[PDB]
Amino acid sequence: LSDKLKEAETRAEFAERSVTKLEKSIDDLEDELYAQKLKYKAISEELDHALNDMTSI
Amino acid sequence: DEDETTALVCDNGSGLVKAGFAGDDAPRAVFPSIVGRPRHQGVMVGMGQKDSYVGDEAQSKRGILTLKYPIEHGIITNWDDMEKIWHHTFYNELRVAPEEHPTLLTEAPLNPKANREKMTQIMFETFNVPAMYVAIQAVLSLYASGRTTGIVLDSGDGVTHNVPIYEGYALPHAIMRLDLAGRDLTDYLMKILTERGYSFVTTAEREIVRDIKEKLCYVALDFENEMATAASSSSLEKSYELPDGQVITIGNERFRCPETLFQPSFIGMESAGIHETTYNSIMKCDIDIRKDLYANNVMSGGTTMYPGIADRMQKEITALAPSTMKIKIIAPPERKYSVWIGGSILASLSTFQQMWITKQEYDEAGPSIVHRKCF
Amino acid sequence: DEDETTALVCDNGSGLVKAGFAGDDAPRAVFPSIVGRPRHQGVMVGMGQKDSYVGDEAQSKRGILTLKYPIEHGIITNWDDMEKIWHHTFYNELRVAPEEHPTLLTEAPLNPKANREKMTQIMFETFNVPAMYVAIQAVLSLYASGRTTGIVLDSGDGVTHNVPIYEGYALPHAIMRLDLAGRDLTDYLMKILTERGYSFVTTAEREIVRDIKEKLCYVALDFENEMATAASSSSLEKSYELPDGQVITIGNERFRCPETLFQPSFIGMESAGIHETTYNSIMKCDIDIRKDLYANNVMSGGTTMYPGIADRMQKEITALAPSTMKIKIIAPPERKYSVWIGGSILASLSTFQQMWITKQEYDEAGPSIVHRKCF
């Protein structure tokens, strides 16, 4: 059980270390996502507005 | 037995007491907040036998003792019994005399004034502590977690206080004090285990159910689906071994208990749950504060160790929160020991030495002084 | 039961519902804006039992109900519960039916437009009222007090409005709408009574605290001096008897709560207090206006009934105001219920009978019509 435990703890800790990395990947991913959305939003909107106001040329 | 005049850290709650020396990373003396007394007539003579037993003594001889807790829902109701817990914790287990060790105690932000002043009085008049401080558990939780900002959910045995801090400052108008805690979850389990044919009412029985809860219960991420299978099959049952060799097998009660955190009506409480209170602690803060508190939802104290709770909470707050916004839970393995760790960090901080009330200021002002000097 | 098609007048706020008929000098009946619902599972059969209770029914059976207020700091959101409140107000108290009477409702000048549109929609579509008119609370407050010129200080349960009116005209740029109200005082008192060892967190407890506040509280002319003695001696304490026979003794909390009106920081609000908002609303007006507004600061709504409130605000305004000029607060006995009276005055003016939205114009345009027809 000790070896199974060390293996289960290895799996739990492996996975905990890995999930921590994945959680970090999510935090980074969401920040990247926000950057994609925010930049997209900013670009699509800065153009809708730039073209809606800048219509006379 | 310590090599420095370092303040002790003693997180004394309605459940357990975590005590140790400031500057370290863990408590050294951990006892239940229990004072036990015999409820039987003696027959043999020359048997020793104490008038009262404390901490581990109270549990080791509990077969014939009635066990009481001096602390209830965040406050000391029996300070004489706390002197007994403290004397043992300090002199027998930590092996330190408070006379040379100032000692940091803990409290919730909206905790009654009487408790903070009574704790101050006992340490100065019974233990002759050279100085005192009573700390906010939320402060200590944020130090331990490496933060100055966040919502501290201190969800222990007594009270869930739901208290926000931003840039190290309290935001007291947004504290959502909640009358739902680990002690109620234990009582709920005793009632639904009665439904299964295993009534638990006496001290031995009360201690067993608390142990069952700590070992078997969880929240998971979806109550109704978990209940649909737990109520239909033995595949979600777990057996618990009772002290006499008998066993109890528990099904959906395993999750129905802690679900009270999300469904307080289970114990007759008028509340929407801990995620609503977490949400309001964030929402009731200014709009330019909210973003930092959403990203720093901090788990602290007991019940934070129910499987699925850190993610269950992030999901439940996200469900109430505006879209786009990132809701994040801070839930390190140092969960529940974080108040003790913060106590160590704060007590030993050079920037906080002037925050200790000395036994000069104490006698000139009396114990009410803690209310003006600690924060 | 009325012998004339007199307008019905009602102030449906976040606190109380005041109602009567146009032409009277007082509401005929006043009760809380509450719709209550059972928070328990029924076990006895043939017990009647409603799905929801209204007004005094909601309070009378509150032991097992959760109680909600449909109006949130001046705006109606739960229109379904308000339909029940109006039906009760009109049919079970005034014994009138809106179908046979035009109806006047009122709101603050900077109240979101949604409030006026929803009130108009429900009275025309569910009560079939022949006509509607949403009045300004500030207009009604000065009609009742007898002024065409002055500052409306309507400091009630929902929101404090602070609006200068001169010769019957609004001076809207000087309105200081403030999120400081009688509703916050109830919750703040629950928190400072918790500090004294009497925690209050539930609806029943909130209704108990609202009763403590209404019967024991005052502000005082000099806060710090009143505080120094209340904090030092039992001579400024007053007891309160709770519904269950418990007795709470209250000291400086008796005024520290109400003092939040002058010191909003007590509840985490970014504000200089009601006396400064009054002062600035006048200071933003022309100098040939200011001479009349400073001499006519007019109280309306609850909290204006606290001992020391008119003297406290007049003192602070006078201290901030220039010399030679006179500063005065008008605080008539027709307090807290004066806006209703103003509604009666407006509803009964001959000059007001052309201001009604009829149930013709309403259906052709829809409820948005109130935004163009009333003001």
Next chain:
Amino acid sequence: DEDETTALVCDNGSGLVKAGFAGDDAPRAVFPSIVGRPRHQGVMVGMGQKDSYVGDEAQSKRGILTLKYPIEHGIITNWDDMEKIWHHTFYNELRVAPEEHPTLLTEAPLNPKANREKMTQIMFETFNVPAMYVAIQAVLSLYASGRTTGIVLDSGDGVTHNVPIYEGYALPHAIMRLDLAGRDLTDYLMKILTERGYSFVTTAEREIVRDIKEKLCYVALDFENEMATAASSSSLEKSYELPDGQVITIGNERFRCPETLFQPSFIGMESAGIHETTYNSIMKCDIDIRKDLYANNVMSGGTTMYPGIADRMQKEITALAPSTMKIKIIAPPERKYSVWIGGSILASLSTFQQMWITKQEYDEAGPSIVHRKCF
């Protein structure tokens, strides 16, 4: 960093401060004219925390700060805060200590003498500047735009000045100073967004509304027609993202706020608007001056960057002006940033070296010297 004693140049408004050095064609940094202070009690220990925050620090930490502006309607009312702003503005970002470099500060032509005297006193006694000059904002705008002639509209956050200049001469009898400005436009937007269900009353909320205005608002070439459609259909609405992930959708309020410049009655101001203010300055000048002022309406300061303003101001003056005459607005992309640039131009002109007050003349005469030397 500098290899010559170039003057340092700042344009300090009631809004923001633009800063850089003499001889450049652009500011190097911009700071808001803000000093922030915490409105909460610290609970944690050792989290740093300043007594006050300056400029961009004040906005970055604003979640718990009250934010104050030291400048109102064109003058400094709080110079202790301006000293912190100037240290930050000149030394922390531009990296130049005024002790070794002359400084140029700006003012409106009728700006109270007390303000130019304090600007002079502060830089000489607190910063030990070797020399000072206080410049007229209208002069600076004309230099930057390449004009010696025109009506300068400095239409920013504080005050609209409106001064005609011809062939480099002031025509003071034709100045139409008006207490209508960008700060009032923001206040109006806060009140009309309140009508839409989004009340804004705290500092964080005020700063959001100023951000909404700057990103969403415009004046429109034809307000009443633009409003007729914006107030009738969602097709002219634009959303804004609030800091907590919530959004606000704005319709005609998007242009009704800026419209107060043309319709000041929206905020209770006794004015026909900025285009009649401009027109009257032209009208009051001599008949052989008028033709050049009609052809040169000069745009400087804030609000000059609203969509439709350059085209609207030329149209509105054309509508007031005689026929035959050519009405022209000077409104390039470098519009408004003309006042900072002019400060740089003036400070570095060879014909203006004798106009600097040295810290010789200053101490012999005292700060009243600026009134005798700058113009």
